[PDB]
């Protein structure tokens, strides 16, 4: 997966040629977003203050007799997306 990167793929072990090709120095020169957040924690705490003047929920579509399958389908889609993605959004909690 990491094609053309200083970071090597997950070599199974020293038996694989990729194990002896990449260095830890190259790995430590690339910072993941979590490492960036850990690096800017004090800056985030001190300098992130701008709030939108107004806050609203998204516009809602209302019909007297909607197709009874649209709303449950949207609810299931939202539930699955939340169950898969909300744990991954926890690092941005202080920013939010």
């Amino acid at each position: 997966q990491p094609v053309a990167s200083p970071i090597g793929p997950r070599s199974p072990g020293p038996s694989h040629p990729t194990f002896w090709t990449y260095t830890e120095a190259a790995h430590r020169a690339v910072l993941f977003p979590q490492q960036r957040l850990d690096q800017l924690s004090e800056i985030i705490e001190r300098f992130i203050f701008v709030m939108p003047p107004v806050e609203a929920p998204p516009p809602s579509l209302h019909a007297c007799h909607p197709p009874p399958w649209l709303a449950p389908r949207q609810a299931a889609f939202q539930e699955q997306l939340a169950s898969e993605l909300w744990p991954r959004a926890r690092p941005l909690h202080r920013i939010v």
């Binding site: 003047p53 107004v54 806050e55 609203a56 998204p58 909690h93």
Partner: protein, 433 residues
Amino acid sequence: QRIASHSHVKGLGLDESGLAKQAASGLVGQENAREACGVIVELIKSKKMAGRAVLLAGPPGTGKTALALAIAQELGSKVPFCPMVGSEVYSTEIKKTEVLMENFRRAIGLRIKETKEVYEGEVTELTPCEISHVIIGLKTAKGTKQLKLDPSIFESLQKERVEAGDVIYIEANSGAVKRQGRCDTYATEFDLEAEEYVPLPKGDVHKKKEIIQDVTLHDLDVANARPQGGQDILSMMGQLMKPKKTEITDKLRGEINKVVNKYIDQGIAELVPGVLFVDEVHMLDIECFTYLHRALESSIAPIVIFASNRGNCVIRGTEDITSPHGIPLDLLDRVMIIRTMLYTPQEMKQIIKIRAQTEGINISEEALNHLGEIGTKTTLRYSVQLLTPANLLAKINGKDSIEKEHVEEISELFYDAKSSAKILADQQDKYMK
């Protein structure tokens, strides 16, 4: 506080009858222009007319922007004042007319009464109730209360890592949960806990506070076009995948108009029509002017002040169409033109003295006369800009005031536009292009 180019302008310097005092509020001349700007200020304060456009016309250095900022100072900080440059309509995200419309709506403000519901106390019980709700117990110095909250609030509490003994702040309107710290009563249990302690809240568990919020129509449009108030996954997805501005539709603006009218009818909102200022109007193109026709003809639009120093100049976006101010005659028919005049040497000396006082510079009378003579040629801007370098020279030589020698030295060190033009003409073969 740093001293900017217009830091001395505090007002229009008008008397009670509307006539312009000679030197007042950091303004020296332009009596007719100042009286016209006072009339415009009264028009803005009337809050009756919509989409009335004013053009400040005159050569550069005649204080058009100074007059606009003086209008702003006369109005006050409550009345919105959106300063935009004509070059700012050329965005790579939205169309130019969208930028103009957004700047139009930014000028209309709304003072709205709001009530905030607050749950604040030390957590004594955090019991999930199976989607799982939460039953929470909060204590303050005045009492204790138990609350049942939505699962979203429970998720927020988990994200804040709220546990029994932590002091928390909950805003019921926005569902915003903030963990402030572990209660001070537990600060003695350990020696190294890696915690920030906070005293027990001294009010009630449940509080209601009424506050005045200052918002604009543009803020409502943005909030309803890129929503982030649901705290759901879809809002986060939309924010992350679509961060660019969008062309807000007329339907959304009509809905916002209806909402604001309903708020005003309910008595909880007050409208402040406000002012839009476009400085380099000649930098707009013909499409922007054509849009501004209809935009000014709107009954919702604010008061727009235009400025221009161009003479008979070609309108941008046209091939060779030339108009008196860079503005097509159709838009000039919709504006009231305020004319600014060139300054006399006496007015130049007055402005130089005012700028010196603003920058905290002591200047001798001989130096003031020499610098006014320097300003008679070249420009007033150059003469004003020589004050600080001359002050630095005087400070280096140990003098607390500027003498004529310092002004002469500075003028020798730094050239003006005309001197540089002469140098370029004399040495055209040595410079590039």
